[PDB]
Each structure stands twice: as structure tokens, then as C-alpha cells.
Ligand binder design. Structure first.
Ligand SMILES: *[C@@H]1O[C@H](CO)[C@@H](O[C@@H]2O[C@H](CO)[C@@H](O[C@@H]3O[C@H](CO[C@H]4O[C@H](CO[C@H]5O[C@H](CO)[C@@H](O)[C@H](O)[C@@H]5O)[C@@H](O)[C@H](O[C@H]5O[C@H](CO)[C@@H](O)[C@H](O)[C@@H]5O)[C@@H]4O)[C@@H](O)[C@H](O[C@H]4O[C@H](CO)[C@@H](O)[C@H](O)[C@@H]4O[C@H]4O[C@H](CO)[C@@H](O)[C@H](O)[C@@H]4O)[C@@H]3O)[C@H](O)[C@H]2NC(C)=O)[C@H](O)[C@H]1NC(C)=O
Ligand SMILES: [Cl-]
Ligand SMILES: [Zn+2]
Ligand SMILES: [Zn+2]
Length: 341
């Protein structure tokens, strides 16, 4: 005591100290932290159906908005989920989401905190549709410095500030569609900003456990974690691409994600695996929901600065973030209007 229980592979657990937990992370191992829960097909459209509408919404994306939000978000000393910094950064992000909702005038759209047993709350923004079939867009809002998690500097600009501002800007543009804002889409859309991802997927485990216990009908979940770093790709002489993960994800949903990238982005896809417990999509998968995951690059070309003080906004390519904004908008809109899910 304190003893943390980690799940490193299906049905395989290890009891560790907190220091050993961060040492595992530093070696590249991921896991679910299951300390508090110690014993714990959908067919998609074959092609895009709303190309004219989505192409017009894409013209409203503004890459200056990514940097306007990411700069002050990264100025929190860290956004560590067990720190008062992480409570304050979540409250700040909640205020930014609320400013977008209030300025849209969309009567039924809300954001609410999801409480956890640590100071940093997750955030869920909801766009009600005509049915409770739900499409989820996710990113994690916490950051960590693995050499000193509680008090170490962690700007978290790429990991995962980039994903946060990607889906926040897609959320803003979605609310400019009159039918979506009025609640007339056949399906409900939610934007999730997960707390405590760096501690072992703590916030997304809580959310999808509760959704499963309440029989929430999640028809698709897309996670984005690190959407901004292209220098590794360009240094290697490789084509700028959207990375698509192929393990711990739903195969049909991943095929649909590639349809979305082919239709709405101007760069190609590149497949990789990233292992067990890799990001918050793994929590959706664990609790039985179909999930997919996109990120910045091919395997091994991602930011080498993550989990340190050097994960700064100067490493982020906002033209690449814009490509992820386009795919987020297309994924959300096409599935919001997929009445056969
Ligand atoms: C959703 O909706 C959106 C709309 O919002 C849809 O957008 C459409 O998307 C498609 C696909 O992405 C686009 O098609 C592609 O468009 C470009 C057109 O680019 C213009 O420039 C060309 C180059 O011109 C320069 O160079 C010439 C050299 O001769 C100069 O003379 C010029 O001055 C320029 O400097 C130009 O050639 C094009 O002209 C053609 O189109 C006009 C407009 O209709 C005609 O007047 C012309 O006569 C001529 O037909 C154009 O003005 C093209 O480059 C793409 O063509 C390639 O791909 C075709 C399909 O594969 C293929 O048949 C062509 O031969 C061509 O192939 C060439 O390129 C390949 C690589 O790309 C090579 O491998 C190959 O060897 C060959 O060299 C293609 O036409 C639409 O433009 C775009 N439309 C709009 C309105 O935005 C979107 O499709 C929708 N999505 C869905 C439904 O999923
Ligand atoms: Cl990471
Ligand atoms: Zn991350
Ligand atoms: Zn991380």
C-alpha cells in the first residue's frame, strides 16, 4: 500500500507501486489501471452520402482556432489527473466548450463534467438527435511528465492537446449546421474529453463501464491521440499520412474510417498496431462498443517529446491538425445521419 493493479494483457494482472507504474510507462508498456475494479455487429455505410454538405462545412474549419486554444491549454504547468492543475485545466476546457455552445444558440446541446475519484473530471458534450443511438468522438485532456508526474512540467501539446483542439473545432463547426443544432439528426453525437488517460485509461473506463451498465447504445467511437507531429514523417522522407490503428478496434468501423479519410482528407492512410491499453478506444472496446483510432503518423514516426517538458506547441503542425479536423467532421456528420446503424 499503495498497491496499484494493472492489466497489461487480456486477463493478466500485476500489482505495482506508483513508481513502478510510471517506470512501465517509460518503457512503452500500456495497461488498464483496474485497481478500483479489480476483477474487471454494426454495419456501416459503404460510401459517403453527405459529401456536398460536409465539403461546405469543411470550409468553415479555421486552423487559427486550434492554436488559439492549444497555446493556453499547454500553459497549465501540467494537466496531471491527480493534481489540482488537472482540475483547473478541465474546468477551463469546460468553459471553452460552453462558450461554443452558448454562442451557437443550440437549445438542446450541453456539456457536463463526469466525476471521478481524482480531481480532474472528464467532460461530455452532447448533441441530442432523434434516437439514442450514439456516435462518440474522443480525445484525452490530461498530460503527464513521466520523470515527475505530480509536479513536473507537462505542456502536453501533441499528447493530447492536439486531439482535444481537433475535436473541439469539429464540434464548433458541426453546430453551424441548422439540422444538427436543432436535434434533427437521426442519431445522437457526443464529444468526450477523457480525464486520467495517462494513469491507465481511468476516465474512459469509468465512462464506458457506466454506459454499459445503463445500456447506452454506442454505435461508433473514434479516438484521436496525437494528431499534430509530422516532422518525424518528413525527416524520414515518407508521405504525410493519417495513421490508422488496427488492433483492439472494430474491423467494420475501421473500414468506415478509411472511407472517411479517402473522401474528406487530402492525405493517405497508413496502418499500424499500438498494443494493449493503448488509448481510450481500448476502454470502449473492453466494454463491448465498436471503436476506431486515428493519429498523426506511421509507426515509429510519432512525437519523441511526449511525456516530457518538451511536448510543446512548437512541435505541432497545424496544417496536419486541420486534416484530422476534416476527418472528425466527416465521421461525425456521416454517422449522425446513418439511420441504419
Ligand atoms: C465531394 O464534392 C467535391 C466538391 O466539393 C468533389 O470535388 C471533386 O474532387 C475530385 C477528386 O478529388 C476532383 O477531381 C480531380 O480534379 C483535378 C482537377 O484539377 C484542375 O486542374 C487540372 C490541372 O490543371 C493545371 O494543369 C493544366 C495542365 O494541362 C493546365 O492547363 C491548367 O491551367 C492548370 O494549371 C486540370 O487538368 C483539370 O481540368 C479538368 O477539369 C476541368 C473542370 O471540369 C475541365 O474543364 C477540363 O477540361 C479537365 O477535364 C482541373 O481544371 C484533376 O487533376 C483530377 O483529374 C485526375 O484524376 C481523374 C480521376 O482519377 C483522371 O480521370 C484525370 O485524367 C486526372 O488524372 C491525372 O492525375 C492523376 C493523379 O491525380 C495521374 O495519376 C494521371 O496520370 C493524370 O495525370 C480530378 O479530375 C474535382 O476537381 C473536384 N471538384 C470540385 C468541384 O471541387 C469530390 O469529388 C466529392 N467527393 C466524393 C463524391 O466522394
Ligand atoms: Cl501516449
Ligand atoms: Zn495520449
Ligand atoms: Zn501519453
Amino acid at each position: 500500500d499503495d498497491q496499484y493493479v494493472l492489466e497489461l494483457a487480456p486477463g493478466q494482472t500485476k500489482v505495482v507501486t506508483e513508481a513502478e507504474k510510471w517506470a512501465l510507462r517509460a518503457e512503452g508498456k500500456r495497461f488498464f489501471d483496474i485497481t478500483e475494479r479489480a476483477s474487471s455487429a454494426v454495419t456501416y455505410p459503404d460510401s459517403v452520402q453527405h459529401n456536398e454538405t460536409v465539403q461546405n462545412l469543411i470550409k468553415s474549419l479555421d486552423k487559427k482556432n486550434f492554436e488559439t486554444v492549444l497555446q493556453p491549454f499547454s500553459e497549465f504547468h501540467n494537466r496531471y489527473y491527480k493534481s489540482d492543475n488537472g482540475k483547473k485545466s478541465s474546468e477551463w476546457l469546460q468553459g471553452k466548450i460552453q462558450e461554443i455552445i452558448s454562442a451557437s444558440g443550440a437549445k438542446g446541446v450541453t456539456v457536463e463534467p463526469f466525476k471521478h475519484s481524482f480531481p480532474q473530471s472528464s467532460l461530455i458534450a452532447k448533441i441530442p438527435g432523434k434516437s439514442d443511438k450514439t456516435i462518440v468522438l474522443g480525445a484525452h485532456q490530461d498530460s503527464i511528465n513521466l520523470d515527475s508526474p505530480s509536479e513536473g512540467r507537462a505542456p502536453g501539446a501533441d499528447d493530447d492537446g492536439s486531439g482535444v483542439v481537433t475535436i473541439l473545432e469539429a464540434f464548433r463547426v458541426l453546430l453551424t449546421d441548422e439540422k444538427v443544432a436543432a436535434g434533427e439528426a437521426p442519431n445522437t453525437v457526443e464529444f468526450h474529453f477523457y480525464a486520467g488517460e495517462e494513469g491507465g485509461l481511468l476516465g474512459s473506463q469509468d465512462i464506458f463501464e457506466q454506459y454499459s451498465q445503463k445500456s447506452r447504445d454506442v454505435k461508433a467511437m473514434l479516438q484521436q491521440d496525437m494528431t499534430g507531429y509530422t516532422k518525424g514523417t518528413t525527416d524520414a522522407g515518407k508521405p504525410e499520412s493519417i495513421g490508422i490503428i488496427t488492433d483492439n478496434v472494430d474491423e467494420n468501423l475501421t473500414k468506415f474510417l478509411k472511407v472517411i479519410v479517402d473522401a474528406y482528407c487530402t492525405i493517405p492512410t497508413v496502418d499500424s498496431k499500438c498494443g494493449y491499453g493503448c488509448s481510450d478506444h481500448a476502454s470502449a472496446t473492453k466494454y463491448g462498443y465498436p471503436a476506431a483510432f486515428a493519429f498523426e503518423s506511421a509507426f515509429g514516426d510519432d512525437s519523441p517529446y511526449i511525456h516530457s517538458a518538451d511536448d510543446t506547441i512548437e512541435t505541432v503542425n497545424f496544417d496536419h491538425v486541420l486534416q484530422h479536423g476534416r476527418l472528425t467532421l466527416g465521421f461525425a456528420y456521416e454517422l449522425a445521419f446513418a439511420d441504419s446503424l
